[PDB]
Design an enzyme around this catalytic site. Structure first.
Site, PDB file in Angstrom:
ATOM      1  N   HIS A  68      50.153  37.747  41.715  1.00  0.00           N
ATOM      2  CA  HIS A  68      50.504  38.286  43.077  1.00  0.00           C
ATOM      3  C   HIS A  68      52.141  38.338  43.204  1.00  0.00           C
ATOM      4  O   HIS A  68      52.689  37.678  43.707  1.00  0.00           O
ATOM      5  CB  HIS A  68      50.224  37.080  44.011  1.00  0.00           C
ATOM      6  CG  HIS A  68      48.790  36.921  44.466  1.00  0.00           C
ATOM      7  ND1 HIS A  68      48.158  35.913  43.697  1.00  0.00           N
ATOM      8  CD2 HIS A  68      47.917  37.623  45.060  1.00  0.00           C
ATOM      9  CE1 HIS A  68      46.861  35.981  44.057  1.00  0.00           C
ATOM     10  NE2 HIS A  68      46.813  37.075  45.086  1.00  0.00           N
ATOM     11  N   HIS A  85      51.490  44.110  41.560  1.00  0.00           N
ATOM     12  CA  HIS A  85      50.134  43.920  42.361  1.00  0.00           C
ATOM     13  C   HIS A  85      50.467  44.682  43.837  1.00  0.00           C
ATOM     14  O   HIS A  85      49.810  45.496  44.322  1.00  0.00           O
ATOM     15  CB  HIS A  85      49.698  42.573  42.819  1.00  0.00           C
ATOM     16  CG  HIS A  85      48.647  42.266  43.725  1.00  0.00           C
ATOM     17  ND1 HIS A  85      47.545  42.902  43.509  1.00  0.00           N
ATOM     18  CD2 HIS A  85      48.582  41.751  44.850  1.00  0.00           C
ATOM     19  CE1 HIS A  85      46.869  42.485  44.520  1.00  0.00           C
ATOM     20  NE2 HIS A  85      47.469  41.878  45.313  1.00  0.00           N
ATOM     21  N   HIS A  95      51.837  43.333  51.578  1.00  0.00           N
ATOM     22  CA  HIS A  95      50.619  42.334  51.978  1.00  0.00           C
ATOM     23  C   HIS A  95      50.714  41.197  51.338  1.00  0.00           C
ATOM     24  O   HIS A  95      50.114  40.172  51.686  1.00  0.00           O
ATOM     25  CB  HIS A  95      49.310  43.216  51.833  1.00  0.00           C
ATOM     26  CG  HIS A  95      48.826  42.948  50.637  1.00  0.00           C
ATOM     27  ND1 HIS A  95      49.535  43.647  49.277  1.00  0.00           N
ATOM     28  CD2 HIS A  95      48.142  42.288  49.779  1.00  0.00           C
ATOM     29  CE1 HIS A  95      48.744  43.379  48.172  1.00  0.00           C
ATOM     30  NE2 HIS A  95      47.789  42.516  48.583  1.00  0.00           N
ATOM     31  N   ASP A  96      51.564  40.880  50.122  1.00  0.00           N
ATOM     32  CA  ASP A  96      51.574  39.592  49.667  1.00  0.00           C
ATOM     33  C   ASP A  96      53.100  39.128  49.354  1.00  0.00           C
ATOM     34  O   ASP A  96      53.323  38.135  48.462  1.00  0.00           O
ATOM     35  CB  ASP A  96      50.883  39.487  48.250  1.00  0.00           C
ATOM     36  CG  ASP A  96      49.466  39.339  48.166  1.00  0.00           C
ATOM     37  OD1 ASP A  96      49.038  38.698  49.056  1.00  0.00           O
ATOM     38  OD2 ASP A  96      48.931  39.710  47.326  1.00  0.00           O
ATOM     39  N   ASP A 108      43.074  45.796  48.045  1.00  0.00           N
ATOM     40  CA  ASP A 108      43.541  44.547  47.456  1.00  0.00           C
ATOM     41  C   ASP A 108      42.324  44.096  46.187  1.00  0.00           C
ATOM     42  O   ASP A 108      43.213  43.172  45.431  1.00  0.00           O
ATOM     43  CB  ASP A 108      43.281  43.332  48.318  1.00  0.00           C
ATOM     44  CG  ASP A 108      44.127  42.058  48.196  1.00  0.00           C
ATOM     45  OD1 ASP A 108      45.035  42.335  47.488  1.00  0.00           O
ATOM     46  OD2 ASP A 108      43.624  41.075  48.600  1.00  0.00           O
ATOM     47  N   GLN A 149      32.575  36.014  36.963  1.00  0.00           N
ATOM     48  CA  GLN A 149      32.912  37.496  37.399  1.00  0.00           C
ATOM     49  C   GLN A 149      31.658  38.266  37.973  1.00  0.00           C
ATOM     50  O   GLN A 149      31.737  38.916  38.873  1.00  0.00           O
ATOM     51  CB  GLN A 149      33.707  38.166  36.274  1.00  0.00           C
ATOM     52  CG  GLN A 149      35.033  37.757  36.255  1.00  0.00           C
ATOM     53  CD  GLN A 149      35.912  38.099  37.290  1.00  0.00           C
ATOM     54  OE1 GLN A 149      36.303  39.102  37.697  1.00  0.00           O
ATOM     55  NE2 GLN A 149      36.491  36.974  38.130  1.00  0.00           N
TER      56      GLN A 149
HETATM   57  C1  LIG Z   1      40.016  38.240  45.349  1.00  0.00           C
HETATM   58  N1  LIG Z   1      40.066  37.137  44.482  1.00  0.00           N
HETATM   59  C2  LIG Z   1      39.760  35.870  45.350  1.00  0.00           C
HETATM   60  C3  LIG Z   1      39.144  37.034  43.334  1.00  0.00           C
HETATM   61  N2  LIG Z   1      38.474  35.999  42.916  1.00  0.00           N
HETATM   62  C4  LIG Z   1      37.734  36.208  41.536  1.00  0.00           C
HETATM   63  C5  LIG Z   1      37.089  34.824  41.236  1.00  0.00           C
HETATM   64  C6  LIG Z   1      35.579  34.652  41.308  1.00  0.00           C
HETATM   65  C7  LIG Z   1      35.081  33.439  40.856  1.00  0.00           C
HETATM   66  C8  LIG Z   1      33.428  33.047  41.161  1.00  0.00           C
HETATM   67  C9  LIG Z   1      33.333  32.149  40.272  1.00  0.00           C
HETATM   68  N3  LIG Z   1      34.288  32.109  39.055  1.00  0.00           N
HETATM   69  C10 LIG Z   1      34.367  31.375  38.104  1.00  0.00           C
HETATM   70  C11 LIG Z   1      33.635  30.381  37.971  1.00  0.00           C
HETATM   71  C12 LIG Z   1      33.654  29.599  36.795  1.00  0.00           C
HETATM   72  C13 LIG Z   1      34.568  29.851  35.704  1.00  0.00           C
HETATM   73  C14 LIG Z   1      35.379  31.055  35.938  1.00  0.00           C
HETATM   74  N4  LIG Z   1      35.319  31.865  37.108  1.00  0.00           N
HETATM   75  C15 LIG Z   1      35.241  33.120  39.538  1.00  0.00           C
HETATM   76  N5  LIG Z   1      37.875  37.067  40.799  1.00  0.00           N
HETATM   77  C16 LIG Z   1      38.658  38.237  41.228  1.00  0.00           C
HETATM   78  C17 LIG Z   1      38.798  39.318  40.235  1.00  0.00           C
HETATM   79  C18 LIG Z   1      39.340  40.452  40.620  1.00  0.00           C
HETATM   80  C19 LIG Z   1      39.834  40.355  41.989  1.00  0.00           C
HETATM   81 CL1  LIG Z   1      40.872  41.929  42.204  1.00  0.00          CL
HETATM   82  C20 LIG Z   1      39.987  39.357  42.594  1.00  0.00           C
HETATM   83  C21 LIG Z   1      39.350  38.409  42.452  1.00  0.00           C
HETATM   84 MG   LIG Z   2      47.234  37.984  49.618  1.00  0.00          MG
HETATM   85 ZN   LIG Z   3      46.770  40.936  47.472  1.00  0.00          ZN
END
Ligand SMILES: CN(C)c1nc(CC[C@H]2CCN(c3ccccn3)C2)nc2ccc(Cl)cc12
Ligand SMILES: [Mg+2]
Ligand SMILES: [Zn+2]
EC number: 3.1.4.17
Length: 313
Positions: free
Chosen positions: A68, A72, A106-107, A217, A269
């Site tokens: 962040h 970004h 935005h951040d 974002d 993911q």
């Molecule tokens: C937007 N933001 C909250 C984001 N959150 C996650 C996490 C998902 C998560 C849901 C489950 N999780 C796990 C669970 C166990 C071990 C590891 N991960 C990842 N991946 C992103 C990827 C790209 C972008 Cl650009 C934003 C995000």
């Molecule tokens: Mg933000």
């Molecule tokens: Zn952002």
């Protein structure tokens, strides 16, 4: 007045594409942003000296966190640039002005922690702003920088136009609270599918700009796979530091924030692409057909995470 920004040939061509990566040369990022404002908005939108002074004060108010950060900010502004340039006639003069600024800001002053962590830590910002805690802070920092001497890039707007652009910015910044995206996208899905979606209704334009903000974002999921995969490293470096801080408060963090559970990243993911990313770009492509390359690149990256799980990488 007659002083255009020009980029090297590779950047000049590839900046037009949704999957453009702004590169590791931090000193070129201001010039890339000014380039985008001049083609998206016009050379007359802003006084160059004020815009340059605003960009540098914005940069100074991003912190040296893994994800962040200033890179970004500029990356999210470029995704907005690509959406606006592929949808020439759909947006107002004030929207063109407001939305690239909103994305760059935005951040502002992000610390690498979620709204949840601030609330569990009992951070002062969580008592000042009970929902969308960091996003209200990011808008508060944007108004601060706009009010510094020589930083009012909107100085030539009428009073009522100035109020409208700061209202486009406030809503665009609040909309980056992902807690707000789920409901916003459902309402857009119903509106599009019952044919009630109306781009002359201000409350509907606000929804469509909110979805554009989530799409910009999340735009790391729409890059070429080596960019997506290496960005995921920075994203998790923050999540895992937050988990560490949860453990210091005597709270078992959720698995996505627990470094002991790195092995589950690929499946995590997968869920994210299926619950958030693919739905986001699908609804965006239905409302704004020329944004389909974002959905296509997201689907390409979902298929790469499937390969990781199958042990083919
Ligand atoms: C937007 N933001 C909250 C984001 N959150 C996650 C996490 C998902 C998560 C849901 C489950 N999780 C796990 C669970 C166990 C071990 C590891 N991960 C990842 N991946 C992103 C990827 C790209 C972008 Cl650009 C934003 C995000
Ligand atoms: Mg933000
Ligand atoms: Zn952002």
């Amino acid at each position: 007045g007659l002083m255009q920004f020009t980029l090297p040939v590779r950047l000049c061509k590839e900046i037009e594409l949704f999957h453009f990566d702004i590169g590791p040369f931090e000193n070129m990022w201001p010039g890339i942003f000014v380039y985008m404002v001049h083609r998206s908005c016009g050379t007359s939108c802003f006084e160059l000296e004020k815009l340059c002074r605003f960009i540098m004060s914005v940069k100074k108010n991003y912190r040296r966190v893994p994800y962040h950060n200033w890179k970004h900010a500029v990356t999210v502004a470029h995704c907005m640039y690509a959406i606006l340039q592929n949808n020439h006639t759909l947006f107002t003069d004030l929207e063109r002005k407001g939305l690239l600024i909103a994305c760059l800001c935005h951040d502002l002053d992000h610390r690498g922690f979620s709204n949840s962590y601030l609330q569990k830590f009992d951070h002062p910002l969580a008592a000042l702003y009970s929902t969308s805690t960091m996003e209200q802070h990011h808008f508060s920092q944007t108004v601060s920088i706009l009010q510094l001497e020589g930083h009012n890039i909107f100085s030539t707007l009428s009073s009522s136009e100035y109020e409208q652009v700061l209202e486009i910015i406030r809503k665009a910044i609040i909309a980056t609270d992902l807690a707000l995206y789920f409901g916003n996208r459902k309402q857009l899905e119903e509106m599009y599918q019952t044919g009630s979606l109306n781009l002359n209704n201000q409350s509907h334009r606000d929804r469509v700009i909110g979805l554009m903000m989530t799409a910009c974002d999340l735009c790391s999921v729409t890059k070429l796979w080596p960019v997506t995969k290496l960005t995921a490293n920075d994203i998790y470096a923050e999540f895992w530091a937050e988990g560490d801080e949860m453990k210091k408060l005597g709270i078992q963090p959720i698995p996505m924030m627990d470094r002991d559970k790195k092995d589950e990243v690929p499946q995590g993911q997968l869920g994210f692409y299926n619950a958030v990313a693919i739905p986001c770009y699908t609804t965006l492509t239905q409302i704004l057909p020329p944004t389909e390359p974002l959905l296509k690149a997201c689907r390409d990256n979902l298929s790469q995470w499937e390969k990781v799980i199958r042990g083919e990488e």
